[PDB]
Ligand binder design. Structure first.
Ligand code: SF4
Ligand code: SF4
Ligand SMILES: [Cu+2]
Ligand SMILES: [Cu+2]
Lengths: 419, 403, 419, 404
């Protein structure tokens, strides 16, 4: 037992709900106690979705226990099919439903629904939200994605973007523009903007692009084995990472590496004399492992910052996290306790903190310039404006976002000196 | 009537209770789902180091009941070492804690035995399997009630957790009226816990303290059944019903409550300009819907179409139901899909719904106002009657402005 | 002799300098005292320009008067021709050179340089930097732009954008995207993207698009008289003004409207319940008249704000400013003095202030949420990221930028109550 | 070379002067250009409501010295109506004011006749056709000098506007030297103004104060030429010259100064990691270039290929030039294109040039430091020797090895 006040990741069913919400025509009939409908507010509020999350809840009570729970689940699935008319059903359990002995997949199969039904086996007490999303995307691919003849032209699959993801929407657009500039069409983006029909055509792509390993690594590996689809190991966050991604994607596709640097201003604006004070600014970095590794490379190579802190809350990416941290000469802080991150920041006293909203709130009470780079965020952090973190426009956004706290601090400091 | 219930477990009321009781910690024996709910509903509160936490269960904790109890004991010891300022620990139940049959009553007695009397460990359930939203506050108060000391005095008990400014207005208005002692059951500190006896008489402030009403009735307290203090007329009738129990005559009542009534009526009229002549739909969130639909119908001139509550306690909402017009139909059974279909058919001008249902209804073309704000914001008594009207007015004002 | 600490506008030579650094092949040979080269710093640091501004100064001293100072002017223009080798030379004088009796135009004719030479007589003490830019652009158009055959396909001129302009680069990009989506190509962008050849081709466009009247209205009214090119009277800031601009551009071009709404997010994120508290919030507005008039419509018709203060420092647009403010039940604050706007803010006590940089600092001293909407800005108010204020993506940027101060104040207040 | 010069008019001297003189308000009689320059170079200070304003010359102000002077008196009286805190007013001359031939020396006398006991109005010319950059500061100081009272006691005298921390540490080290009470001409308030006489021998802390040096020589005070306190060695020889003039024993001086010299040497060595064996170019910005080159070449090991100074006062800078190696090429006069070609050909590893020139040279691939920062940030004496070294250590050349 551990007393937790802040969780970087929710329960796995929240990740499965993210997969269902990003996808269209996909419904999640979740066996949950009455009052577990709470995570719908995350999608309706944080992401401002004009459509209610495609999730049906049994919402069983104390009276509905034992024999009544299975009947409640079966009625929930059949009524969800009758009402929403989805093209594929996910069935899953909450922590409470995992505790009770109803077999969700067995009931769903017993209903014999016309559309494919995906059985979700997410251990809720030992795993977390990103595992839920990754495993849900996996099982959807296994159920629906099959070996398919490849497109006549070179085509790609954007794998990883799930709902409630940090700037996934704008990253999709930026990577799509990159690939189109190369001459590579995006066959399907999944889970966001996907359908069971699109999961069916996932086998038609010549190669996969794993934008977000946290929510798509299992699906990318499965496609590698069955669908014979190699997936990119480079996440295009930052100029150097974007150019490595350009070269790797061009090699996989067979097209010449072409990228548009015309709107790219991060290198010149870091080379300018105004950015000289940024040299040697110690930075602490925390959040999801992919974003932390990418942001550490951006900071050191393109910003003149010295990385004094580096960590992640995904134990699934501990080995990549430690391997990346060794490159900067530090030991990665792989933990899910915000107290440990606070202790590390206090013992480290970074000049700038790049991380989650928890790290953006630890900095304020310590009076440290802060910016958000990772998944746990607020409604404010989801922007109406185009705010990619990937590609060259994402590099410009990263420059402005990371420099804004330092510029503000310097301006307020000068104002205080001038009284 | 039975189906998907888009409500919150009563672990949500813990957020208000920790704000209203500064010496109370709310330890939640639940899973990562309940901790995630607590942080999502708290929003900014979790970043201020609040006085509620979740003891997340592990697989070994589900497997071993004795192991889980020992680990809970260790966690409570570490909590009290970490936060000595806590004087009352609230071991709240949860859906998993119920399924594992983790008897929190035994743990509460044991920890009260070993950590007594420095910290008093009470047990109540916020599980959504049993409770819902404000029923968490009701369960907390009903768990507080049995341990209250006995008294022989004629004391008025202001049952209900209120914002400090609203509680201050309450006690000021009551003292001006001429009543005797006023105490609040959700006391700020354990030392200020009121006493309940056969002569004790209590008045409900929020229309969801049914189990608290029963627990106080078991101790011999008597209920001042009054319309709940929402708006000018609601506050007026609340204070009038308390006065009839305390002997305050019409002359003193009108010499005390005339000025606040007069200004509150003007404030409501000014802040309810667009509400007049518009229908309002209520979906079951917080059981505030009838006692506040009365305010909207009578004061603001709204024409309520349907009032939905998680469950009616007709005994404590009797006067407020009596002041309701016969026109609105009231529903206690919640199936979110059927209720959304009813909303679509009615096409209400305003739709008081939950946070999850708000944005989709706005995208469909229905103005909505989340009822969670009503519990968090001060909307009680006289000064905030204009704020109460403006809470429902500003969605309609925004819809008119934006089009 | 009014004691001035902050000027909202520089000297007219600064605006002419903005026009010069906007174009390529146009050099500003300025008759100026030594030390008047300070405005080069503005272009090299504020806008972060890679190359030196195309400005050559005489930098005379007290030892050089009479025949000498004219000789330094001759040497400066000749040296500019020899080493800078521009396709066109434009000659002006500073305040000090305006006082001294040296004819800038006559000496240029005496040189008989092959490149076209335009003389800008800009009243330094009567007028200001916006008039300087407008009159410089007008003189450049008069000398180089000539009537020519219309382009085969429909094309437009983006008139107004200059260097040091607020969001001019990203607004150019956004309006270009909006016109290409509409089937209208951009014949030229002048003077920020133009050249003497492009200024010559200005007459080829079917119509002009007056992006910024402050700097482009004189050239638009001249091109509506000599090149017979009507200009759009609406500036596309905000959703409603963007639709008005699309309608007028379709009417002028004859093409279908075809507005691309798919990436619009301002309407929904303003209609969402998270923006309910925005209703009735009082906003004070100051800055150049175009941006203030557009931002008032955005704040009222699109964000639920009530406008309590509406003003401009650009007295050239006094009639449009007052006419716009009359529609909001206000008296327009047409003043060049920042103490007057300070008094207006203190009297009104708004909840949000949208203005220039001094407006932002006044708000910061007064503790009012502030966002920058107008031309006088810092280096920090030139983003590397794509930050249009115009068009549909400009609407999203506007929503985020105007809402960020309110969100940050609300969050700070909530944290203060909680802790 | 007489060509285009990319240097600031001396009204920029006001910007850092008023931070040291908290009693003085500087009123500039100029056009919109001078107010715009003043606000642009001030930056955030103008938002912080500072003590410099520009009495903007209007078209009606251009014609008529009597009328314009009357409006000037109106504005000055209005300003002391707003600002009774200030006792010093500087009628800073500007280029349009000089062209108008608007006598501001007369105006200072008239305003001193009006409210002399209440306000002491000084007068100098920060005009561009007359004065360049820190020549504004030294012109203001030289204007202050003649009004200063005479004294008959030999006291150590400090000339130059310095940050309060730097001034405090300088007077602290001078006191641990033991002989010679100190005094600073740019006093924070006119009440604590110094007494200047023939006996008070004055030491100059910043090179560009040549007009102030001349004005102090008119008073009878003689100058002790010394290398200016930039880095450990320059500060050491400055203090050694001061001690020798006051007869402080060599062993006592070395013993008292050893610790800060050691700390400064450690700090300059730590900062000068990428500076050794490097080439530095100086464009004429602030007249600090000779002492800058001395410090860099000797302590930092950075060979100077060309030292450019807008005005080289050889008499005062003589000890510093003696300390400087023969290799650096000192140049007088500024033609921006000639010096740009010179830096392009020399291919320097660092170029200490103006801010209007810094970013273009970075675009061309040259590492640039802007010397306008130097007059702002504390770069004097041991306690700031490390910061001074690191300021040239990472104006790129620590970012170049990071960007490229
Ligand atoms: S409904 Fe049950 S499992 Fe879900 S958050 Fe509430 S108490 Fe926890
Ligand atoms: S003093 Fe002369 S050179 Fe300096 S800003 Fe004024 S006009 Fe320009
Ligand atoms: Cu901020
Ligand atoms: Cu900010």
């Amino acid at each position: 037992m551990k007393l937790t006040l802040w969780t970087y990741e929710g329960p796995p069913h929240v990740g499965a709900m993210r997969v269902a919400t990003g996808m269209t025509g996909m419904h999640y009939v979740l066996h949950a106690p009455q009052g577990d409908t709470y995570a719908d507010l995350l999608f309706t509020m944080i992401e401002r979705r004009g459509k209610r999350p495609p999730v049906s809840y049994t919402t069983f009570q104390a009276r509905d226990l034992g024999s009544d729970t299975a009947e409640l689940f079966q009625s929930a699935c059949r009524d969800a099919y009758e009402r929403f008319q989805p093209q594929a059903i996910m069935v899953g359990s909450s922590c409470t439903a995992e505790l009770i002995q109803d077999d969700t997949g067995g009931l769903a199969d017993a209903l014999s629904l016309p559309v494919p039904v995906v059985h979700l086996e997410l251990p809720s007490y030992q795993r977390k939200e990103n595992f839920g999303a990754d495993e849900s995307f996996l099982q959807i691919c296994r159920k629906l994605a099959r070996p398919m003849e490849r497109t006549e032209k070179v085509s790609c699959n954007l794998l990883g973007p799930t709902a409630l993801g940090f700037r996934h929407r704008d990253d999709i657009l930026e990577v799509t523009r990159l690939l189109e500039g190369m001459g590579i069409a995006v066959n399907a983006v999944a889970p966001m903007g996907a359908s069971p029909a699109d999961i069916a055509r996932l086998g038609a792509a010549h190669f996969n692009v794993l934008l977000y390993p946290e929510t798509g690594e299992s699906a990318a590996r499965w496609a590698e084995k069955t669908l014979k689809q190699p997936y990119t190991k480079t996440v295009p966050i930052g100029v150097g990472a974007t150019r490595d991604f350009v070269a790797e994607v061009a090699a996989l596709a067979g097209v010449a590496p072409v990228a548009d640097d015309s709107r790219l201003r991060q290198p010149w604006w870091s080379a300018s004399v105004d950015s000289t004070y940024l040299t040697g600014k110690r930075v602490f970095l925390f959040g999801d492992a992919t974003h932390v590794i990418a942001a550490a490379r951006v900071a050191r190579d393109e910003m003149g910052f010295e990385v004094v802190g580096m960590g992640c809350y995904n134990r699934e990416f501990a080995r990549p996290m430690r391997a990346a941290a060794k490159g900067y000469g530090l030991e990665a802080l792989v933990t899910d306790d915000y107290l440990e991150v606070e202790e590390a920041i206090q013992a480290l006293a970074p000049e700038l903190i790049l991380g989650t909203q928890m790290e953006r709130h630890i900095a304020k009470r310590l009076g440290i310039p802060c910016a958000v780079i990772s998944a746990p965020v607020h409604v404010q952090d989801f922007p109406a404006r185009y705010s990619p973190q990937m590609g060259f426009e994402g590099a410009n956004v990263l420059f402005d976002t990371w420099i804004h706290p330092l510029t503000m601090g310097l301006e307020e400091h000068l104002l205080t000196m001038f009284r | 009537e039975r189906g998907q219930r888009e409500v919150f477990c009563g672990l949500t009321g813990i957020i208000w209770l920790h704000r209203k009781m500064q010496d109370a910690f709310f330890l939640v024996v639940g899973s990562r789902t309940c901790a995630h709910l607590l942080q999502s509903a708290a929003g900014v509160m979790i970043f201020a180091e609040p006085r509620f936490g979740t003891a997340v269960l592990e697989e070994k904790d589900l497997a071993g009941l004795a192991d889980a109890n020992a680990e809970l004991d260790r966690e409570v010891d570490r909590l009290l070492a970490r936060r000595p300022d806590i004087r009352q620990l609230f071991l709240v139940g949860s859906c998993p804690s119920e399924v594992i049959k983790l008897d929190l009553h035994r743990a509460a007695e044991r920890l009260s035995a070993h950590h007594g009397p420095a910290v008093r460990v009470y047990n109540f359930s916020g599980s959504g399997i049993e409770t819902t939203f404000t029923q968490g506050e009701d369960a907390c108060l009903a768990s507080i009630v049995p341990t209250l000391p006995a008294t022989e005095a004629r004391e008025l008990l202001l049952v209900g957790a209120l914002p400090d400014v609203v509680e201050d207005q309450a006690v000021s208005l009551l003292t001006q009226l001429g009543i005797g002692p006023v105490r609040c059951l959700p006391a700020h500190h354990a030392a200020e816990a009121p006493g309940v006896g056969p002569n004790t008489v209590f008045a409900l402030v929020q229309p969801f303290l049914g189990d608290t009403h029963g627990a106080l009735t078991r101790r011999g307290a008597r209920h001042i059944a009054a319309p709940f203090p929402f708006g000018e007329e609601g506050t007026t009738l609340w204070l009038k019903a308390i006065a009839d129990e305390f002997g305050v005559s019409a002359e003193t009542f009108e010499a005390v409550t005339a000025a606040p009534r007069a200004r509150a009526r003007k404030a409501v009229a000014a802040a309810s300009e667009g509400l007049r002549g518009k229908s309002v739909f209520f979906l079951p969130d917080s059981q505030l819907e009838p006692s506040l639909a009365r305010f909207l119908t009578r004061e603001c001139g709204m024409s309520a179409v349907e009032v939905g509550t998680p469950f009616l306690h007709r005994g404590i909402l009797g006067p407020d139901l009596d002041l309701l017009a016969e026109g609105p139909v009231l529903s206690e059974g919640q199936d979110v899909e059927r209720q959304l279909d009813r909303v679509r058919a009615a096409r209400p001008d305003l739709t008081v719904c939950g946070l999850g249902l708000a944005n989709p209804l706005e995208a469909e073309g229905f103005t909505t106002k989340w009822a969670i704000e009503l519990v968090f914001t001060p909307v009680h008594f006289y000064e905030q009657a204009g704020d109460l009207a403006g809470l429902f007015s500003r969605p309609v004002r925004r819809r008119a402005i934006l089009r």
